[PDB]
Amino acid sequence: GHMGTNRPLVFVDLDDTLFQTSRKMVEGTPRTTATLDVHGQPNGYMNPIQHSFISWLLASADVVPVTARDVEAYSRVKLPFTEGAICSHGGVMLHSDGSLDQDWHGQMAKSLWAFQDRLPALSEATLRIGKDMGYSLRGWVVEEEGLRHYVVTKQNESDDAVLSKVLAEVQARGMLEGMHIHANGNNLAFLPKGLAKRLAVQEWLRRDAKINGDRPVLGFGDSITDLGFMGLCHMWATPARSQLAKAVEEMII
Amino acid sequence: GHMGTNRPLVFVDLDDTLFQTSRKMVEGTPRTTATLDVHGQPNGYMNPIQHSFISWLLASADVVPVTARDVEAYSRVKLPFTEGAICSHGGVMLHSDGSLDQDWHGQMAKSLWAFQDRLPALSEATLRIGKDMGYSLRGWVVEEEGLRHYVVTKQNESDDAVLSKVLAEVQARGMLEGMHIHANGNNLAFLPKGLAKRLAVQEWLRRDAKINGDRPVLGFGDSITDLGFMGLCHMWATPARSQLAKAVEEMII
Ligand SMILES: [Mg+2]
Ligand SMILES: [Mg+2]
């Protein structure tokens, strides 16, 4: 029979699904502010269709962000999400009021303690292996309170093909066993096995089913690696020009 | 500025996206009737998630079916669509009250007159070429009012790989120039160039923009060939276990 709410539960990626930076839009086109930079100034935008879409979705369903952003960067997202969030590539769950989920934090600490020294070492080596190769990079360890989660690397060349080079080398040098990778645009991330959007979405659904039983689940994402959590949904969706959609277009023809 | 409605326009495939036959569901599982056969008895069903999903979508957005079903077969779909429909693989547009769109019918007649004899000939040959390789098939020409639209072929072996064989031969014998194909499950269709869900959806959007300007457009489909019309949308979506989703899963790994 029916229990709890029967409205859809919608897991949404953030960057390049709901909004994007100025450099990824055509100059001069209408837009509204979706994110702020660390200096408090706008740095991510929605075009009019994007704003209409997320407003409709927020009003029509229970919308849960599923994002690589850490808690601080998620707090600079200026959208009125009301149901909590999954942050830091699945390393963090936030309650609706923004407080940290202590249970998941405990489970994550368990999965990631074997990695706590390797992650700073791997970021150091990558940034050095990058200068060695000759690129002007940057990178850091994403961490949430002491617990270190994953490694991210970006380039300042305006050439995202730089990151594919490095990824090819670190793979050869075998610095990535027991881990998985995310590469989209100017972002290359190295993630421990037990850190994934999929695992957090899996847990979110387990908790939801105790309250609301089986209700429609929809997943929205733009990256190929978003297919991990999207495959847990009844239906999944992608923007027409996303990394994922472009890959699908090449597969059919 | 704003004009008309700003609710999403959602183009939805029907068979295997919103519902399916009994043979495609697990025996005994809960279900509700979505379609009737020609004898008036139920023959397509929604599981509880599917029913919750389409009810939500119909209440939340302007939903337009985009279907291979001809007008008679669409009339056996027992869902309360209120905005009209695209039928017969894009060959037919219906107004909200179910009456035929005369303009599109005129444009289709124009595109398909060079095919009016070839389609019965191609169906005849395919059904004969099928008995020769010895499969027990069946097929016919889909037509609405005299104007012939496309050729469909099915098999009674319970072996959908039979149709891939025939398709390989008719392609070799070159009976399909100037045409395109749809193959999913126990269905193989040969379509003239100017007959496509994409063309009708393209026209539907052109008309909508004169009334409602630019509003979010979402496309839902399960077949690889549904990517034609889905690529005209701002976002597209698919059931997690569709032909399309299965192809995407093989492309990534
Ligand atoms: Mg993203
Ligand atoms: Mg279908």
Side-chain angles (χ1 to χ4, degrees), chain A residues 6 52 56 60 234 236-238 240, chain B residues 6 52 56 60 234 236-238 240:
Chain A
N6 200 29
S52 295
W56 172 78
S60 305
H234 297 109
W236 54 259
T238 194
Chain B
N6 200 29
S52 297
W56 172 77
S60 306
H234 296 110
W236 54 258
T238 195

Side-chain angles (χ1 to χ4, degrees), chain B residues 138-179:
Chain B
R138 57 186 173 110
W140 56 89
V141 174
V142 182
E143 60 181 293
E144 229 96 45
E145 249 129 14
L147 188 66
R148 297 158 182 169
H149 290 185
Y150 68 92
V151 162
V152 70
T153 298
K154 306 182 191 210
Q155 49 81 41
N156 314 339
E157 309 267 11
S158 307
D159 187 1
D160 291 348
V162 155
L163 301 172
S164 296
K165 315 278 204 196
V166 187
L167 179 61
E169 189 176 16
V170 207
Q171 285 254 33
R173 300 196 193 197
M175 296 189 176
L176 299 185
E177 302 85 348
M179 306 183 73

Side-chain angles (χ1 to χ4, degrees), chain B residues 13-17 197 222-223 226:
Chain B
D13 180 72
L14 296 186
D15 297 81
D16 311 296
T17 296
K197 297 180 171 194
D222 72 289
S223 294
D226 289 330

Side-chain angles (χ1 to χ4, degrees), chain A residues 5-249:
Chain A
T5 178
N6 200 29
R7 296 205 311 169
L9 178 56
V10 185
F11 293 104
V12 295
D13 180 73
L14 296 186
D15 297 82
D16 310 298
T17 295
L18 302 184
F19 55 74
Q20 60 282 308
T21 59
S22 202
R23 85 183 180 280
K24 290 182 180 183
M25 310 169 69
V26 180
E27 220 165 286
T29 60
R31 64 195 58 185
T32 56
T33 293
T35 67
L36 306 182
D37 61 27
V38 285
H39 310 295
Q41 291 294 300
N43 75 337
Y45 307 91
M46 293 176 293
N47 65 40
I49 290 297
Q50 290 172 317
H51 177 258
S52 295
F53 180 70
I54 186 61
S55 295
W56 172 78
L57 200 66
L58 287 168
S60 305
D62 294 323
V63 178
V64 179
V66 186
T67 185
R69 288 175 174 255
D70 65 9
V71 174
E72 198 261 62
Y74 174 67
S75 79
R76 289 186 268 114
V77 175
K78 304 284 132 187
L79 290 168
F81 296 111
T82 60
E83 304 303 314
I86 295 163
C87 300
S88 294
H89 266 297
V92 167
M93 290 179 47
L94 302 178
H95 301 299
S96 46
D97 68 342
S99 61
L100 181 77
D101 189 279
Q102 293 298 330
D103 272 301
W104 190 247
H105 173 65
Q107 297 171 231
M108 287 305 306
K110 209 175 83 74
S111 308
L112 300 188
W113 212 71
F115 288 83
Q116 286 308 289
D117 291 333
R118 180 178 172 189
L119 289 161
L122 176 60
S123 181
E124 172 245 339
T126 296
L127 290 183
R128 187 61 53 171
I129 301 317
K131 174 196 292 290
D132 262 33
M133 294 214 146
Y135 307 116
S136 167
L137 272 8
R138 58 186 173 109
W140 56 89
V141 174
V142 182
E143 70 176 82
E144 295 280 47
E145 253 143 2
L147 189 66
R148 298 158 181 168
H149 290 185
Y150 69 92
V151 162
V152 69
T153 298
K154 306 183 191 210
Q155 49 81 42
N156 314 340
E157 309 267 11
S158 307
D159 187 2
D160 291 348
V162 155
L163 301 171
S164 296
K165 315 278 204 196
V166 187
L167 179 61
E169 189 176 16
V170 207
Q171 285 255 33
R173 300 197 193 196
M175 296 189 176
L176 299 185
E177 302 85 347
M179 306 183 73
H180 51 118
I181 75 107
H182 165 77
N184 190 4
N186 186 26
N187 192 282
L188 171 71
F190 308 137
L191 286 70
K193 183 180 183 303
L195 175 79
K197 299 181 169 192
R198 181 180 175 91
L199 293 166
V201 168
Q202 179 177 75
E203 171 66 12
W204 196 290
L205 289 167
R206 196 195 58 80
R207 296 169 179 199
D208 187 68
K210 303 203 298 186
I211 303 164
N212 296 302
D214 218 44
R215 63 177 168 147
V217 179
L218 180 44
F220 279 84
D222 72 288
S223 295
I224 294 160
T225 60
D226 289 330
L227 280 167
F229 82 84
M230 283 157 81
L232 299 178
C233 304
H234 297 109
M235 21 214 12
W236 54 259
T238 194
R241 299 286 312 288
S242 60
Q243 174 188 68
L244 174 53
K246 292 182 178 175
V248 173
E249 104 188 327

